[PDB]
Symmetry: C5
Subunit: 203 residues, 5 copies
């Protein structure tokens, strides 16, 4: 089986998406913890898992040709991955988990990096019943909507793994598709907007 896997990988190992060969990446966010809210600089720090999924013809294989192998794990540097970027980060994003993706015989890839992000956020009112609200856009930095498209499986941020003893509780968190125009180029870019309303948790 080891030989089969090796052979498959060898046989497998695409210049990224193009206007003729567009790509749809599905984004989903799991919010694990709001670590810190700095009212002196208006930066908030999030820990979250960013689920990325996409599908490439060039990654399909017949499991029957490879000992019934239906999927495998490989370093994310072994394959192409989307340049999904936070548009209002204030520090470089920190990766908390192993950079390893899962590839299925149907040519779909799933890559779920855990990250810590500092982004621009005014925490004013976090100490009130209404809480504070902040938002950060996630999308390709260099690919327009014509090259890379984004969609979500749902507009509800997954909160099932949120840290129950965090300094902050989540009142709501959504994730929404957006189309933006920027001064630099004619073509529009796509992002998923993460909107979180949150409040200091009482002990």
């Amino acid at each position: 089986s080891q030989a089969n896997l090796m052979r498959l990988k060898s046989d497998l190992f695409y210049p990224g998406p193009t206007k003729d060969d567009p790509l749809t990446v599905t984004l989903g966010f799991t919010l694990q913890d709001i670590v810190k809210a700095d009212s002196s600089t208006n930066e908030v720090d999030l820990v979250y898992w960013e689920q990325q999924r996409w599908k490439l013809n060039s990654l399909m294989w017949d499991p029957n040709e490879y000992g019934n192998i239906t999927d495998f794990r490989t370093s994310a540097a072994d394959i192409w991955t989307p340049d999904i970027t936070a548009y209002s980060s204030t520090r470089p994003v920190q990766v908390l988990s192993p950079q390893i993706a899962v590839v299925t015989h149907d040519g779909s890839v799933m890559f779920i990096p855990a990250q810590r992000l500092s982004f621009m956020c005014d925490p004013t009112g976090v100490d009130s019943e209404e809480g504070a609200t902040c938002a950060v856009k996630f999308g390709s930095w260099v690919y327009s909507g014509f090259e890379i498209d984004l969609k979500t499986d749902t507009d509800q941020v997954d909160l099932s793994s949120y840290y129950a003893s965090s300094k902050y509780e989540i009142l709501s968190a959504t994730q929404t598709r957006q189309v933006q125009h920027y001064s630099c180029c004619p073509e529009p870019y796509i992002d998923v907007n993460l909107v979180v309303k949150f409040r200091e948790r009482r002990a």
Copy 2:
């Protein structure tokens, strides 16, 4: 003589130098923690910083060799990047874990591998009660990030965290530290999932 033993080790490393575990070729990884120090308990962000040695042990057929065919060499040291290693991860870290020791593993002729990285970890933890008699209790799960229980099974030698190297003058004293294997099931998948749950009860040490 000494030149002959070097040649022997070189030939052995050449011959040995695996796509990782699979459902058909599963792997048991043994984890063990040696808790060295609780450096810091931040009640303003609810992060606690631990220093520990994380002992990982696994066994591969593809790393076996007959010692008599290589000058009685029973084991050797090699860079951790020369071999496959488990993607064991803390599930609730708040910053990238920091490695404090050389990334080198010990390989034994039976194919068993021992890898003990030293690490500093910030993880999610409410230190409420740390200043009390009963202390604070926090927990952090360690497991594979991308492998299920059908590819990587985890085991412990014991459920007692090794405290023989715990820093005696730490700001915090350990009341109890346990390491327990956990098997869980999720709706999304049929495969069982495994992790080792590190639970530490600690309080402020009196000077």
Copy 3:
């Protein structure tokens, strides 16, 4: 047909890369610079340093990067790692920490041989924020230019003297009273040759909550 389009791109990239030593006095380069100011994160009066987040739009044109779209299936542009190509050494002349890169280091190349590179960056630079809590506010400046190329190898241009503020963080601790980007020419002790820079002048003030 899609496998053909991928092959075409691979062919184009292949031809261009496996075929530029940077600008010279004989073959000088004009780099256009534009700044998009996104946030003034912090102003530290203890050390006289200010931290900004901005997008640094860079454009230049290389004959060596030209291709005929018809010969390549109508590809008019492509994305490529900034490491696969030459990029200008545009540098802040008064930073106090290494610039932090916040965006993927990828450039866009068009068939006419022009490149567009827009790194998002956080920059700490020298700045006395005195008066930032006053009506007139505080003024600060930071020069941007090549570190090693003189005005003879690299010339700088702007498309406008007005910094793009259309993306400035509305709820920042600081608000922008004005922000300009202006071409300048300076001389240094080490070298006779002039160096060219774009001066970023920002007048800012504490935003009333």
Copy 4:
């Protein structure tokens, strides 16, 4: 002539590297590393976390047969400098650091024709240390062991030249003054392994310096 010497060094380096290989020490071919510390500064002592930060130079010395050469055979070159990445280096590690060590100096070693290597990285280290009593006459006492992380005493042995830490470069205007600093060899056993491991124990007694 000068070109001749350059060529000679190149030839030598090439003979030693590209065409020689040393897999590290073993039970049959064990290595002895001489360790010495030049303590330069106690930068900070944090009583809230019990961490102390040291700046020091760590003099490492070992000798390999496979690095020996005949100077007469290479234009009388008796030594040379090379990137520490071109040769094997001991995995000498502090056993109680709380953060990754920070390297302050270029990672370049000196190789001598007898096969001896000298490597002296300057480092800043945060390690576990209770600084209670640092404001007393007696001062505070802390210790930290340095040893190979993965080699037992059967593969790597350690020794010092002297038990006296080199204090001739200690920063005279540091916040903290040194009352004594010793470096001592130790043999220890750890639960994971049967084999004993070797360390040099750096023990420092220090005190707040009066202005």
Copy 5:
């Protein structure tokens, strides 16, 4: 034009200095800013440009054979560079500028990296009229005086680019060559000693 430069660089692209082939490095400091003076740890943070110059025969060429090229720019990683090091830094020095050098046809190299350095320094008196005085030595870490010699053009630090609105004003800054011995080796080591007297600037 581009072809000539490419040919030249290819033709050019030395194991470092030796006793039989020593090297003289000229050092010059341009002090731009004293960012911070920390009296709790006795560390001071400097921002400066460190001009390095040296000459290699093996980098010489005839401009006549190369389209009249008299100089070119190249990555500092393409050539040997001197391991000039602050002897009393307390943090890894941080490089603020692109690692690129200028090579001239006579074989002379000029390399001017901007750096931020924390180094050992008691800032006591910095709030007085006479100010505070600190020093830090710069030299090769591993080449003795028999392999690398150092020198300044002048003993006066270039203050022409010093930040006018720094928290600290410069009363004087000098750069002087020194010969020193260390316990580790019999051979002498060469350094250039940066001595700065400074005080808090009145607003």
